[model samples]
Target: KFPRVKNWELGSITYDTLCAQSQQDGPCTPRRCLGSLVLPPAEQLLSQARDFINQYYSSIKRSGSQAHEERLQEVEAEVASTGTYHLRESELVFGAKQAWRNAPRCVGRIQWGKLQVFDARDCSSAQEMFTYICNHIKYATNRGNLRSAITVFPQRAPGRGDFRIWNSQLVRYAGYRQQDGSVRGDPANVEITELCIQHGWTPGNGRFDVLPLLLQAPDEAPELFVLPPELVLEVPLEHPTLEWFAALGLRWYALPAVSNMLLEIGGLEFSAAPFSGWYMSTEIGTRNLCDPHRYNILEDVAVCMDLDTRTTSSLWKDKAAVEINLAVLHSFQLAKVTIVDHHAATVSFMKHLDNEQKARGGCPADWAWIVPPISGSLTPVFHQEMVNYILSPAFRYQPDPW
Candidate 1:
C-alpha cells in the first residue's frame, strides 16, 4: 500500500493523466457524443483540481519548512524501519507478470554473455526440478533484493518451467548429501540446472570457467543451466582439530569437523556450518562428480592451504605426523580429490608425516597420529573421523591477547 502524503496525492494526479491518455482520441467530450447526455459541469473539473491542490498543497504549505523536514524525516524513518516489503498474493502475481517481461531478456543477455544452460524446460527430473526452482527464485528476487517477488506452485505439474526458471535464478542451490557423509552429484534439480544455464555453466568443468548456452539437455531430460551462486561453495575452517585432518592428507569429509567445532564454539549446528560441503574423491571416479578437475594435486589446485598455525609432530614412534590447519576460501565445495599417480597418492597421506616428531620429556605434542600413512583408498570411516574433528568447536579456543 502507498503512504498517505502529498507526493502520493500527486501520484493520483499522474495516474489520472495516465488514464486519460489511455482513452482513444484523448479525453471524452460532450460535443463528440451524438446522443443528448448530462455531463458534469466544467466547474467539476476545476473543483476536483482545486480540492486536490487545497487538500494536499495547502497541507504542505501550512506545515511550513520545519514540517517539511519532519515529513522527510518521517519518510526516511519509515523506510529505515522496514526490512523488506512482503507482497500480497496479488502483488506477487503482478510481480511475476513484470518479471516475465524483464527476466527472460536478462537471462537471455546473460546467456549471450556466455552463460549456458541445458534448456529452460528441463525440470522433468527431480534434480533438474530442484535446481530450476532454486535458481529461478534467486534470479526473480534479483539476487535477494526483491525477496517477496517469488513463489512456488504447491501442486507439481508439467510446464511450470517459468516457475522453475524463476526459482532457479533466485534461490540458493543446496547440494545433495548421502547418509554416510558423502555428497552426490551437483544437486541435479531442475532449479539448479536453470541457474547453471543462466550463468553459462557446464557439468564437470571447474566452476571458474563460463559454460556455453547452446548446450541443450539430453533427449527425454530437461535441459540444465548454471547460475552464479551455484558456482561458488564456501567451506569453513575455524576448528584447530580439523586442521590436523588436512595435515594427514585427507581432503574429503571435513564438514563434520567444521560443524562440530562451530557448535562447540556456541554456534548453531545448521547455522554454524554451510548447508553442505564437497570434496573430490579420485577413488569415486570423476564421472560421478561435478568438477572432476578441481580434484587435482597441489600443482593443479589453484587454492592452497595456508600454513599458518599448522604443526608437525612425531606422534608415531617411527613415523612422522603432519597437521594442516586449512579452510576452503571459496563458495563451493571441492567435489573430489584427484590422485593422478602413486607419488601423489603417497604424498597425499605420507606428506603429513614429514613434520611429525616424538614427544620429548614432559612436553607433549599438541597432536598425535596412530599409524603410518598407507597408500590405498582411505576408508570412509577416516573421512567421517576428520569431519568430526573439524566440526568440533572446542578446538576453536584462542587465548585473549591482553
Candidate 2:
C-alpha cells in the first residue's frame, strides 16, 4: 500500500511555538515590514511552506505527455459507443475498502507509466488488460480486436497432428524458456492429450480421437495456427466461461461439457444435487405405480377405458390380468483428472427409469429420470468431493490446475 502521511508523526510542534522558541533562545536581529519588532504570522508562514512543498512534489510526479489524454479520449470514445467506461470513483473506493478488509497485511506497489499500468503479469494489470480488451473489441475492427493490446496475447486453437508434435509446438510458442535451455511446457497441452486418451483414443497413435492431430511434413517449417478472428466475435458475450477458456486456447470438448455441468450445478436457483432430488420424482412415481402388492387390489380395480368415448369398458370378464415390463438404458461419460499425462477415469451410468418407461409401451419422457449406476453409483459424496475440490483455496491461488 502507498505510505500514509500523518501530521502527528512528522512533528506535533506548531509553527508559532517553533518561531517563539527560536526568538526566546537568541537575540532577535531581523529587517521586516514591521521594522524588526514584529514577527511574521505563524499561520501564513506554515501555509506558504506547505504550498511550496506541494507544488514541488506535483512538478516532480506529474506526467507531461499527451499519452494519458489520448488514452482517456479512446476510453471516452468506447463509452460513447458502447456505454461502458472505466472504473468509477465509488468502485475504486469500495474496492480499496474491501481490500483493507480482506488482506490488511498485504502491501500494493504504486505503478508508473501507461505500459506498466496495463501489463498483464499482475492481477491488477490483468484486470486493466481485460478492461482494455473489452474497449478495443467494442470499438475496433474484428481483426484488430483479436490482436492483444495487453502484455499477454491470446493463444491459438490446437490443430491436428501427433499429440507430442502439437504439444511440442504449443510449448515452443507459449512455454517459458529457462536460461538452462529447458522449456516449461504448457500444462494445457498435457491435459488435452490426456483427455483424448481417456476417451479411448491412443493420443499420439490417433484412433477415434475427438481432435485428431494433423501432422505436417518433417521438411516443412512450423506454421502458427491462427484461428479466424470472427470466431471471437461469434462467441456468446453472455457466456463468459466460453470466452475465457477460449482465450486460453481450449476447445469445446468433454472438459467444457463437464465445466458446463459444474456451472449449471453451481448456478441453480435452489440447492439440489445435479440430475437428482425432485427431478427424479418421475422415476419414484414409476416404481411406486408398478408395485401391485402396495395397491389395495380389491378397491382399486383395474379398468380398461375406450379411447374414443372415455368410458370404462371390459373386453373380457373373470380373467386374470398381469402387466410385466421393466428395462434400463445405459450410457457412458468420461472425466479427466490429475496432471500426469495418462491419469484419467471413465464413468458409465444407466437411465433405468427411462428404459422402464419405454419397455412399458408408454411414450418416453422428454428427459431421462433416475440415471442409475452402470460402472459406479451417483453418490452425493462424489459430487460434494468435486465441489470441494474446485472451491479449494489451493486451486484459487494458481492460474490453472490440471
Candidate 3:
C-alpha cells in the first residue's frame, strides 16, 4: 500500500507511489510505470519546475539567463540518466516552506515561512541519519520553546531501496498490550513498539516509555537506536486550578516531529525526511489523549472532572475533553512550552489563508483536516471552504517501512 494524493479537483486519489521495498522502475505510462510503478510523472516534473521558476525567479529571470529553460532541460536530462533529478539548495529551501504553507493538515502554517532545513544528503550510513535526527530533535525541541524544522536525507534512486526512518515520529511512547487485551500508553504505537523490541530494544514498564528509533539506510539492513531522553522535550501535564489533574500522570512532548514522511521537491523524493512543529493543544489534548485508538483518556478524565458519564446526553465526554485541552494549555504555559490552543490556532490558520491568497493566489487545504477535531464547527475555518491539491515541495505520507 502507498499514500496517494487526494486532489479535490480530481476528486480522487492519483499518482500512487507504492512502497514495500519496491524499487522496480521502467518507462511505461506517463502517470505510472507498467511494471515498476515508479518515477515522478514526466508531466509533474515539468509542471513543478516551471512553477518554481515562474513563481520564484520570474522577477529577475534574464532573457539571456535562460535559467528557467536550462533548469527544465536539467530535469529531463537527469531523469534520463538516473530515473530521477535533483533539487538545488535554493529549490529545496523554498520547497520546504512551500510544503509547509501548502500543508492542509497543519494549523501552524503561519510559521511556515520560518522553517529551518537541514540537508543531510551527504549521509551514507544509518548512524549518520541517526545523528542528524537526534540533532534535529534536540535543536527543534529547544528546551521548551519548539522551533519548526525538517532534516532531509538522500533521495530515492531507481536501483536501490529508499532510506527510511521507521518510527512515525522521533519521540513517541511504547504501546504494550496487556494480558487483559488493553493497551498501556499509546496504543497506536504498538506496531512500532514491537518492531523496536524485535530489533533488540528492551521495553520499559511505564506509561511514557520512549521507543527506540529504527533506521533503515539505503541498501543496508535496518538498525535500532534509542534517543537520548534530553533530546526529547516533554511537558508534564497538569492544570493550573485543578489539583486533581496532577494525579493523572499525563505528559506530552513539546515537539510533534513527524519522522516517517516523504519530502518531494520537484520530482525528487527524500523518503527519510523528518519534520517538526510545536504542538497545538488539541492535537495532544484531543487526539493523542482522547482518541479511542490512542490513550482513550476521556472516561478517566471525565471521572476525575466529576462529570456524569452515564449518558451521552450528559455531555460528559465533551466537557472532559475541554478540561483535558485546558490542562494542556495550562501545563505547557507553566512549563514555558510553546503550545497553541485550538481557537488561536484556527484563527491563525484563517490569517494564513488570507496571507497565502495575497502571496500565492490560492492555498491548498483539506477541509476535513483543517477543521479542528474537538470543536469542529466552532472554529472559523469550519465555516470557510477549502480546496486540496498536490503541490510540489510537499511532505507526504509513504507506506510504513516494510
Among these predicted structures, which one has the highest lDDT?
A: 3
> For residues 1-402, what per-residue lDDT tens digits would candidate 3 score against the true structure?
444444343354333231222222224455853332222276666666566655455535543367877876777787666556778877788878877876657778899879899989989999999999988988898888788899989988879999999989888999998999988879999888988888899999889998888999877779999888877788899987889898989999888889888886665778988999888888899999999889899999888778889999999999999999999999999999988888999999988877766665566666767788988888877876664555655777788877
Please provide the root mean square deviation of candidate 2 (C-alpha atoms, Å).
30.3
Deviating ranges (above 4 Å) for candidate 3? 1-56, 59-66
- Assess the local accuracy of residue 129 in candidate 3 as a C-alpha lDDT between 0 and 100: 91
Cα lDDT computed for each candidate against the true fold: 0.25, 0.21, 0.79
- What's each prediction's TM-score? 0.19, 0.16, 0.86
lDDT tens readout by residue for model 1, 261-318: 1111111011111111122223222211213332223322222333322333422211
For residues 371-398, could you state the per-residue lDDT of candidate 2 as single tens digits?
2212123321122111000110000011
| Cα lDDT, model 2, residue 378 | 33
Ranking the candidates on lDDT from highest down gives 3, 1, 2
TM-score ranking, best first: 3, 1, 2
Give candidate 3's whole-model lDDT.
0.79
